[PDB]
Amino acid sequence: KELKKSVLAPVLDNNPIALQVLGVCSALAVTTKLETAFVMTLAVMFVTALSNFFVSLIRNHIPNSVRIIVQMAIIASLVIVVDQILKAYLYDISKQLSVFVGLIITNCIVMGRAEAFAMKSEPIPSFIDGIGNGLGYGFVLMTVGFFRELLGSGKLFGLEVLPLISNGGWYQPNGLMLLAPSAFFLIGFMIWAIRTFKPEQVEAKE
Amino acid sequence: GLKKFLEDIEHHFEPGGKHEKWFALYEAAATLFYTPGLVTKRSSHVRDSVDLKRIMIMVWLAVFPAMFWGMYNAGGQAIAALNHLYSGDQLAAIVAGNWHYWLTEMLGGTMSSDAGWGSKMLLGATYFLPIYATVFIVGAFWEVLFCMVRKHEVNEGFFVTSILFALIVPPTLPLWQAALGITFGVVVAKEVFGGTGRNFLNPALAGRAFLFFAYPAQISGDLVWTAADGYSGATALSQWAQGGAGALINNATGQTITWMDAFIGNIPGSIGEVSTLALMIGAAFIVYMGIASWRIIGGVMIGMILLSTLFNVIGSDTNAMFNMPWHWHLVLGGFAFGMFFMATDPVSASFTNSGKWAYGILIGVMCVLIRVVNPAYPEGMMLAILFANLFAPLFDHVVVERNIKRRLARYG
Amino acid sequence: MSTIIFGVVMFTLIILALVLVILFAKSKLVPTGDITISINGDPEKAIVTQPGGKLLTALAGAGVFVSSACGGGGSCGQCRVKIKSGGGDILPTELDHISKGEAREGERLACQVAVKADMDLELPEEIFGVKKWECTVISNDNKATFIKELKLAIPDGESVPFRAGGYIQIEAPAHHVKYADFDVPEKYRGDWDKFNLFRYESKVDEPIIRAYSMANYPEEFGIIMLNVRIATPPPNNPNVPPGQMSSYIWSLKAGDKCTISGPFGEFFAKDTDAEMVFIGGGAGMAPMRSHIFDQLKRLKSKRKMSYWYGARSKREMFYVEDFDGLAAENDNFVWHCALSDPQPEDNWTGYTGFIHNVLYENYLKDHEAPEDCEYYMCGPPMMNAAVINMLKNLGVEEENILLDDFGG
Amino acid sequence: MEHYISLLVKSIFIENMALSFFLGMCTFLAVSKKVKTSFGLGIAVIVVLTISVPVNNLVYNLVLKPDALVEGVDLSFLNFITFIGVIAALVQILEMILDRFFPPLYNALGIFLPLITVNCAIFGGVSFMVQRDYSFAESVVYGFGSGVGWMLAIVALAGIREKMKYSDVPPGLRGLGITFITAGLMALGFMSFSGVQL
Amino acid sequence: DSIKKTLFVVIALSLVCSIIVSAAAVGLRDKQKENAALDKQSKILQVAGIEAKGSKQIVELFNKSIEPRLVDFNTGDFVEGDAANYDQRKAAKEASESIKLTAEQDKAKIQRRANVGVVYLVKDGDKTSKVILPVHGNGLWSMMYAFVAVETDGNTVSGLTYYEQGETPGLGGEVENPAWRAQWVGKKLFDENHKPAIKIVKGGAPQGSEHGVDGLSGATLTSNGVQNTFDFWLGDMGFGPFLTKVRDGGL
Amino acid sequence: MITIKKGLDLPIAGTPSQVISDGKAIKKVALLGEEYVGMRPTMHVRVGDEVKKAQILFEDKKNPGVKFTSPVSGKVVEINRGAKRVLQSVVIEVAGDDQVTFDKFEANQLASLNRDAIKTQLVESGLWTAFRTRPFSKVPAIDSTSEAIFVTAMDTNPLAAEPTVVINEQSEAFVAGLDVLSALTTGKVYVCKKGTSLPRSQQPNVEEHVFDGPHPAGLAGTHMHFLYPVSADHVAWSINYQDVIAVGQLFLTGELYTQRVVSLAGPVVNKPRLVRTVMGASLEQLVDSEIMPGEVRIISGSVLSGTKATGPHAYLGRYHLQVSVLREGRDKELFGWAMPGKNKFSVTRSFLGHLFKGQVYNMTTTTNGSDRSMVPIGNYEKVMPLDMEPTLLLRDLCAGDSDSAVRLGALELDEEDLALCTFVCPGKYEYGQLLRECLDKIEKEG
Ligand SMILES: Cc1cc2nc3c(=O)[nH]c(=O)nc-3n(C[C@H](O)[C@H](O)[C@H](O)COP(=O)(O)OP(=O)(O)OC[C@H]3O[C@@H](n4cnc5c(N)ncnc54)[C@H](O)[C@@H]3O)c2cc1C
Ligand SMILES: Cc1cc2nc3c(=O)[nH]c(=O)nc-3n(C[C@H](O)[C@H](O)[C@H](O)COP(=O)(O)O)c2cc1C
Ligand SMILES: Cc1cc2nc3c(=O)[nH]c(=O)nc-3n(C[C@H](O)[C@H](O)[C@H](O)CO)c2cc1C
Ligand code: FES
Ligand code: FES
Ligand SMILES: [Ca+2]
Structure with a gap:
């Protein structure tokens, strides 16, 4: 069955962030809470899948001169719809996500997949590729968010897991897990572990 | 016979031996006790006598006066605060409830106001020694782990990192926090880059920054700089930021902090930073020996003086830090410690004579800038050094490019 | 209702204005003019193309193949050409085949060289003497167990100009062959049936090209002869199809028609x-x-x-x-x-x-x-x-x- | 006058676009191998940002913001499409102008424009401009300062990576992992300006 | 290809995308407005001492229990307008609706004050039991906003909640601690001479004091911010005249 | 005058007495194959063959037309080969006095000779190998020229001989060699010397330049850096004073001149002095009955840069004018690294030794520590006088960044130009081989 390979390879074999360098801004920004990481993962998956589907649908008619304009028009329309829906039904998470909902348009994963696969493949394959890349992105986002939120606030999805001294518990949260360097360090160590368990991705020495 | 024993048990650690996996530790001990006894193979058949062992041991010895005075001062401050707060039965109960205090008393010391220098130094030791031991053991674990896994040889440099980290923390730091800080500093900043001589950040300050930003409540405020139970008291730089020079008063004794007190080290703060005189005495030896960079020190002094005098000339109506002169900037906080022993790390600094001046000037400017125009933090030496570590390579690049142009002009 | 109409109109107008501006800028800025590439400074054998594309295709437009092989990924490195005019800087991947010393004389890989202006070229080895030949198979005998001796005739008393140790390029059309059709004698069939190599088959629906060595010295006039090895699938994963050109050649017999090309060395x-x-x-x-x-x-x-x-x-x-x-x-x-x-x-x-x-x-x-x-x-x-x-x-x-x- | 100098210093040091807001990280990580390449890319970023932010400010103030065109009508939901289209068209037009009229400026910086035709740094800069409601001069100064800060950060990273030629990184950390760790340490160092109330 | 085909394709794509986007954007605006209002309404209900779960209950209780009103700071008396839709935060930035403060007056470091503010009266039938005052001031890292509930004598605090701040979670973020917020109930804003008297005591306030609350441990620079906020907003340039009118039975 | 301030004069014991005396009888000589950079020999002799003086022994595959000839008449007894059959030395046993002779000219005709005739005579006599080329320190191609030929009439290596004493015996030969070089060159001839006087050539393109200061004030690399900076497109030739005397003798008498004056000195030498020897003389026979008992190392050349003279390599080098002998430092000390060394030398001031000015040390071959990474405490700047960035250049060499090293100035350096940097390294790196590897890469890549 070919579908499983397409949906699963970008998770570990060709991870968009750990092997390719794409979508690092949102990974660094929106991983201080697991709910925001989850919502961003879903939004990116949805936008990438539909952009791939439509671009592959009209791949034979795009004029070469303004292909970028056409692709970005489609992507921006999808992102605008997503942003409106989020503000209509998930107002709190939309507030927390800040400008990074609109930055899905410039997220490198969407444009990279649209150019590389959608322009050369059929609609259903392009949609499945988008879903797979979304899952690969979500893997890193959720893994980073789990550690950051747990070790920084004793919570997961806002649920209390580690009682805090301020509430009469036993755990003192780490303040650095709520700041920028923690995401960098966590992503670096995740890449280290991934390339230890799958050494074929190790880079050659310069 | 130590030599006979060492050269007898050697076969156990060679390949195929009973203890082959501990060869790194065995050789470390062997070359600590005796010298390698090797000879030259090529090029220069004669070599200089200096080596990393001496380079590191001299720096380690340079901080002994500061360490001892820091212990003495911590004990004196703690005793003074305790006698200011409590008396009689309350003081007895407080002493009975703290292992530092009742251990000091058990070993022959006294916690009363008439305590001597011996008792004060003992009380300071019961705070300093546990921190240093924890730091050393925890960091050595990681060093040995990396050396074993990557089949390297344990080298010197952590011998200095551990003590420098231990001397720049408050006397009341928790031991688990100290362990976390040393782990971060050793692993994230140095080991992943290949070890000693292959990193770019300062390992000691990297861990201190980790503590600073992860657990700010235990490394800042009025509750951490004097090891007296229940005592709350501000320090010199905070008091200046609040009310100028007139605000410098020691609440434990009701006396006015003077420039001589700040210079000698009769003030609260980090364990080993307080004594500018002791730090100068220590740094003079290593500057004379050629291990520390007088260019870096001069650059730091130049930047500090220039920016402090510019702020003094500009003046301010609501910020009391604008009128702190250079000679007051010199003796407060960790400026002297950082300038003498942490801004001179050879690996983290610029590798060019011209770049060293810029590096020092940048450190000096940033320290005063953070002290004055940043209200969040009363001090900025650690942050300034960590900041200049990022830009030293660019100074090197500029100097190298000018040299390369000179060469292309057939004048080099 | 009014806001929807306004949004539609404004979206369309903004997008159309951007498209029109960029189109006008392109029409007024990009050259759009024809450019000329010349070889060896001659007024002959020159080519004129649109301002774009690779140099290899422009050269192939005049039949100059530059001994290309595998046509992709710089696998061969045979497509080097010397440029004598103010061309562009070499692409980073040309250094894997061209050394720093060679880079100073203008050596570049025709595959990686793009063109948007006039330039001058210098072709080494005078490859203008290449020719394509139609040949008749003389012998396709098995001299051993896995190598076959191919012999081809040259028409009109001609003889390919070559140096000992050179090679030729073989071009074949779309074909479909099965290993069971081979005429392997019994003395060599003993291994083919041992490994059941008749299981295999191969096919291709567009013409393909390959290079092969030449097994006769220059004064052995009138014939081109080769020794071709059967390319079987790797033994670690023998489920993949065998080679194409060798399998095609092994299906021929005396009197068959074939075409050879590209004598280099x-x-x-x-x-x-x-x-x-x-x-x-x-x-x-x-x-x-x-x-x-x-x-x-x-x-x-x-x-x-x-x-x-x-x-x-x-x-x-x-x-x-x-x-x-x-x-x-x-x-x-x-x-x-x-x-x-x-x-x-x-x-x-x-x-x-x-x-x-x-x-x-x-x-x-x-x-x-x-x-x-x-x-x-x-x-x-x-x-x-x-x-x-x-x-x-x-x-x-x-x-x-x-x-x-x-x-x- | 002090207002604009404060804005410039804020944009360069205090609110650093790269290390403080985490924008443009894909390119900031990929193109940090050589100092001169990073310098050219940063110059291109400076130019594109300082040209883009003011134009988007003009468009937003004249068309998109509420009651800008007609009373009771607001078209702020077109912000994303308008900004991205403007940036994309303008970058290509400038690249093309440099290619035709200025071959040397093209070789210098124009070769980097394709990377930044669609970039998180520029888009987030415009987005922050929209939220902060800058004037035209404020937009110009903010764009210039953000570009300069991004150039400073990327050039510092390039210098550190060049210094790292002597390092011995574990095989699993070579490249992406060690660069991520270095960037995290750079952010740790840059947190010195956090509390400045400029 | 031809510009004719290019323009046709782009025009059709733009039409489709614009129709979709405009319809989606214009179809959800009312629900977005409701979502925005609900957040503020929940905080006002909380500080008012009213418990509510769900949007339906929040709206139902807010509509009947809370009566927003506009107040003129200069004269401390009510003004006419659509209080339920007034936006004091942007009103403060408009030059035609706000005043520039002086260095001596700007104790809280807000740099501007709107001409008219909004207060939320709490109703028990037709009678009024409490008035909720929005206040704000600069902390160490961010601008801190809070609601303070004051009874009808104009002196006694019924509750306090900070609903927007950006201080460090450990040191300065404790303004949101329920235990610290509970200390404010029962305190008196003014002394017997009607001067501001709220004091943030460093090191802890004495037990039984009617004007002192414990300062934030290790977070003086934020306690100073709170003290400045209250010193400014209880003075002449804040709700001073309004609170004296309330004391005089204006409600 | 040019004055060098950054440098170091090694205070090693055993300074020779600058008086010449007859040396021990030598019965074997050899030509060392590994001391010529990039040389790939083609043998023209086999074991047992008899040879005449100046008869060819082998040629160079990588440098066509260059001939290496015998220094003495005798019989070939050994052809030593190492790993991968690399030639180590060709050993000749002295017997007889047969020789190959060449054309001879009057002293006043040497300045007007033809460049091609001079080159032909030098190549045929085999004296053409005295020259070396910067960059790459290789024997120049016989079809190339250079605008600058650098003559080295000074020596600052520790325990080295005084060139004035040797030159004062061969003034006419030295002047004739200078005239021949002036005729051979296309630009100028640079005679680098100290403040004292030497015989002068009257040709207008021969110039004397005085250098003052410690080591490396006497190195051809420093002289080139200060008088004629070299690069890929600017190549200079280097030759020492004794080879100039040999050239003068060749063009004056038509015979190859293979006599030498070398310094025999070191901590373990009983009577340090200058001794008359022959090119390629056997050092084991030279130092017989001259050294104190014990395990010692015999070095061909200076202790800063030289070749361990053991077994097949136990012969005087082509470009070496001294022999150094010192003990092998295999002792182990109890906490030796922590002692207050009064007898320990160092360019830093961490030992008590520097407090005793004028002290001389009985230095050995021990390495005072183990190998470590580079911690730049600034020792290289104290010893590097050239306009370079020592720390960055050395780190580029360690990392193997050939392009960066070339940009920083590796093309101007020889192995002996980094001897002090190797000496004073706390990490115990050996930068000569790193420089040679970088230069090999650069030359191989064209
Ligand atoms: C100058 C020159 C001279 C040469 N001379 C000779 C000569 O004299 N004789 C000679 O025999 N060769 C010669 N070669 C080699 C020849 O050019 C080819 O390497 C090959 O021998 C041609 O065989 P083919 O066309 O039948 O099969 P090809 O298709 O060229 O070979 C493809 C191979 O890859 C395998 N393969 C295909 N797909 C996959 C897959 N998905 N996974 C794994 N494996 C796969 C195939 O089974 C087969 O083994 C020469 C090459 C050059 C450059
Ligand atoms: C090397 C060194 C660096 C320091 N760096 C900082 C710093 O960056 N920020 C800070 O708040 N305190 C820093 N400190 C601590 C202060 O110097 C000081 O000990 C502490 O803040 C006590 O308050 P005071 O500075 O008002 O005396 C440092 C101390 C040392 C020894
Ligand atoms: C003069 C001198 C100063 C040093 N200062 C420090 C320091 O401040 N912090 C530290 O961790 N190591 C210090 N070291 C040890 C070592 O150089 C440092 O850990 C390197 O960065 C390791 O590569 C110092 C060494 C010397 C010789
Ligand atoms: S630059 Fe790639 S996602 Fe932002
Ligand atoms: S196919 Fe020959 S180099 Fe590309
Ligand atoms: Ca207001």
């Missing part, structure tokens, strides 16, 4: 007084025979020469009569052969073992100055590696080791 011999040593294995017999015949029959050179061939058994050796005739007619050449597996029917008494070990133990170890000899080598890569290591441990320099590795 870079494996030529040096003209010195030094001794020559030839090491061959498997398919490599062709260039070795070419060099030996060219040196002995045409030039009649008096340099000392020797040939060492590694085999499996007696049923895998060929050109025995030719090499014996050479060694008997002139004493400046000596032929030695070693086979790994002497079967009982072979009645073998000669050298055994691997060819590198045989050569080292019998000839080179006692040689007065092995570094002064010239070594010409062709054959399987895992034999070439061992031979190279053995020669290197004797102090032989790369300048005296000439290698022709089939397939790179």
